[PDB]
Amino acid sequence: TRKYQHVIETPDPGKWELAGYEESLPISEKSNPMTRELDKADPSQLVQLLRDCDAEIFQEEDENLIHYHRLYSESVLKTMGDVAKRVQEVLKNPDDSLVVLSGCGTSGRLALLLANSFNGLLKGLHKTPCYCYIMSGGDRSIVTSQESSEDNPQLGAQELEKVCEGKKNVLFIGISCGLSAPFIAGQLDFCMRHLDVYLPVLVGFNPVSMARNERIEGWHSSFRQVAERLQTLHDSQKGFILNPAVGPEGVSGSSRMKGGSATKILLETLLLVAHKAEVTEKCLLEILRTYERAHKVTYSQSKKIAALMKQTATSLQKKGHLYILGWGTLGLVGIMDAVECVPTYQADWRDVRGFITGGYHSIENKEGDLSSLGPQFSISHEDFVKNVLPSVSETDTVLLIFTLDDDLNQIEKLVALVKEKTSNIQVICHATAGQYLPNSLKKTIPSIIGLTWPILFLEYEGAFIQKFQRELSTKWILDTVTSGAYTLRGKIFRNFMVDFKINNSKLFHRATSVLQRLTGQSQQRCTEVLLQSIYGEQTLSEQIRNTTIAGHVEAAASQDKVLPVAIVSLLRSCTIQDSRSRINSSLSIRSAIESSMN
């Protein structure tokens, strides 16, 4: 915190900044050394750990040590300024120009969030929309996790072409935490083959030399090769790579946390500067400081966050559910944390659900209403009252996220309905200094996570920075609450996931990586025992031994305890069937590994 002026104390570096620390894995896949024993931490300790991981986002680099480029680096800040100047040219010509944000999973949902946010920013100035979003799914992935739709470079390039039809100037921002998603890779490739109208921008948090160098099946290049192509265009100002190192996740792989948070911080700050200059280093630091302010305010309520975590944990224990009701854009942020509970922690979609005021009309998704697609797609407050409410019990936990500028009346009446069914009501309330919570809600609510935001004298843009602060704050809380609850449930071995359904190529390679670090055997043998567990057969044939990874995923998608079985079978020498029976006889998946560990 010596170079620039900061308003939050970040942890000192930083074993992950050394090249010798887990060199096999890229930064985004490495294990965070601060959380080496996260599996055995009480609620308040979990809050502290994750609050420190999120603090690593705002760390600045030491130039003399020659390590990774951080958020506060000359090159990173300069890149943000260059892309911002490109965004301006798009905004100068709203007729034929278009800014496109694209990503997979969380990155995709964030792309939607920021697209609508800056569309509403332009709408406030009576301007025409210039932002579009593209996500793997597509819009069906706003409510459900479709991890399998990530490995298709062709379908990515096509959808990008379909959107920018008729546009003369396109600024594309592909998001991969990450640098692994073939979907984004294909889009960047398509952009570089049409540089007359497309300007490619890659957003990630791994060095270009750490991207996946494995040939994308059914395609010509790897991610690293496509990235290195963009890097040559980068030096010539033809394209741009925005990849500041942010550090490993609290639980490794979960890019929905630091990766998601940094992506939101990075792009919003970048785009805000564009609309403001409609570019100095002074500008960026003013905006980034507000995000640091957002971090401090959020974790000043660590006591309250810890309570909400344990409350959700007790609910999950009693076979209960967490229902997140959000007002405005905070409702969408509520959904983003609910949708990632299914793939990350192997949870039923009924376990954690999110709702928004009001419905898809507020989400502003391009495919309109999706409520007809099934029960889980009913995601408004009206849908919650109609369907969900008359079935919740005492073991359920209902969370409410709103501001002090929302309809405090309809919120007050809603508490009365929920109290009729359950006592576990938690409230995340935002407020601008200095408006105060009425005694009505204050005496009706048990414990409330209240957040007060300082006045912003930042011209027209101040109001949106306020919204971004509230959105990011809510995310961090929901990130910590959901992840912390399932941590208390025993879904984490140390600081990485062991049991997860291999739904894409990245998860397959991750499963291989987990095998490599628990055992001492090579990648050759790790891929073997993994395949042995997927197909069940002890001796792999030839029709499956020459089958592509995409085929293995389609076969492992319907298998449970895939990786845990493969781990035990390699850890102690035994048949896959013996490894499978040893797990069923153990009290937990974690215990089956620890017993086989020695």
């Binding site: 709408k123 000043s300 500028d405 200094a433 200095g434 300082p454 006045i455 004298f457 027209y460 101040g462």
Partner: protein, 426 residues
């Protein structure tokens, strides 16, 4: 004789007691300024739009709004330097005609048109997002509220933003008004029916405003001082009876001791106390005097300004339905004297705590600062002002304080600000 001296001695406070009072005030100020504990603090220390920031804003910058019949006047006040670099204030305005539909229509469409006129003139002067201090003056035809309705109107549009603290109060308006004439004025104070204070705090000290450079007027709302129990060893039994009998049991404790609202009520309770002890009126009072609110605050002011023959004193007590003796009138005056004196010294301690804070925060061994003042009990009440002035000067050692009253005959709030600003411009 000594019995009435023992009853009225509960209001007495020594110089040492005034010291803890002002130090406990300073603690509540610091607690309210911090973002962490602002929620539970009794003194909110609310930030305003009145600021001297490097973004161009200066103290005295104001947007005055005045509705009258079907006419709406927006006034832009901007202060700064000229070519010579000397102090200068400018004034601009524009008239508007309220539609007949908007006048008869609900309050929503009224403020919708109001916000429309504001947006239109701010764009014309290119200061739509400068966040200027706001003030309203109403005068409709004869056949949280105002700021809330205007906020909702701006929200319905959505082309700019306003905060709940945008509108200044009468206390802040006093500071600005006196600042226009004496630029050393950085403290506003009103001691009328209610009591409030505002002062220029360093931006770095205000955690409720994301800024580190410049100064900003902080609306203390210090009337709620003691709401968290830090004033319980200063409040007498009469104060507690007054509190519980009010419309807000437990709120605005400090204001109920130094404010003029319950000044007459405190004197009345003391009078009844003496009557029950056979020290006044023969031991019996009229049914009127035993009713809450019968002893008006203006009575207290008049008795304290009456001759030795008790002409006005006897006249008032006659109306209350009691034939008082000369000894009775003497006892009543001492009771009025006792209550008003406590109000003066405690209000002095509060202001001294602010002044001492500014002195300590500005690293000056001699703080040259003017205090703008207003209010019925400061202006009209005789002995109050002198006792007030003497007590601050006694407690503000290290400061050279100048006091100036608001310009009489111009009104309050925006009307006061607009009038003084126009006078300095011409």
């Amino acid at each position: 004789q000594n019995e009435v001296d023992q009853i009225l001695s509960e209001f007495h406070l020594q110089e040492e007691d005034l010291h803890v009072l002002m130090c406990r005030m300073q603690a509540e100020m610091e607690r309210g300024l911090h973002l962490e504990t602002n929620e539970e603090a009794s003194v909110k220390m609310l930030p305003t739009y009145v600021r001297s920031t490097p973004d161009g804003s200066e103290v005295g910058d104001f947007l005055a709004l005045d509705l009258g019949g079907t006419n709406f006047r927006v006034m832009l006040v901007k202060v700064g330097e000229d070519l010579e670099g000397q102090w200068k204030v400018e004034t601009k305005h524009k008239m508007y005609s309220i539609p007949v539909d908007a006048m008869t229509g609900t309050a929503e469409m009224l403020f919708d048109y109001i916000a429309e006129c504001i947006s239109d003139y701010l764009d014309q002067q290119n200061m739509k997002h400068k966040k200027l201090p706001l003030g309203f003056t109403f005068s409709f035809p004869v056949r949280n509220n105002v700021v809330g309705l205007l906020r909702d109107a701006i929200k319905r549009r959505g082309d700019f933003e306003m905060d709940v603290v945008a509108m200044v109060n009468d206390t802040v308006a006093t500071m600005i008004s006196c600042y226009y004439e004496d630029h050393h004025c950085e403290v506003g104070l009103i001691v009328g029916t209610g009591c409030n204070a505002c002062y220029m705090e360093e931006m770095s000290n205000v955690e409720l405003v994301e800024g580190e450079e410049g100064r900003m007027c902080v609306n203390t709302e210090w009337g709620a001082f003691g709401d968290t129990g830090e004033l319980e060893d200063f409040r007498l039994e009469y104060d507690r009876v007054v509190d519980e009998a009010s419309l807000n049991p437990g709120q605005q404790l400090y204001e109920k001791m130094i404010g003029g609202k319950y000044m007459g009520e405190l004197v009345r309770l003391v009078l009844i106390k003496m009557v029950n002890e056979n020290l006044l009126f023969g031991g019996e009072s009229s049914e009127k005097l035993k009713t809450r609110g019968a002893f008006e605050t203006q009575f207290v002011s008049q008795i304290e300004a009456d001759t030795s023959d008790f002409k006005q004193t006897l006249n008032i007590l006659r109306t209350l339905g009691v034939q008082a003796t000369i000894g009775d009138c003497h006892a009543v005056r001492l009771a009025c004297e006792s209550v008003s004196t406590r109000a003066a010294i405690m209000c002095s301690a509060g202001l001294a705590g602010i002044l001492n804070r500014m002195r300590q925060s500005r690293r000056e061994e001699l703080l040259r600062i003017t205090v703008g003042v207003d209010g019925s009990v400061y202006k009209l009440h005789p002995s109050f002002k002198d006792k007030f002035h003497a007590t601050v000067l006694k407690l503000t050692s290290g400061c050279e304080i100048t006091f100036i009253q608001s310009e009489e005959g111009s009104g309050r709030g925006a009307a006061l600000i607009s009038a003084v600003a126009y006078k300095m411009a011409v």
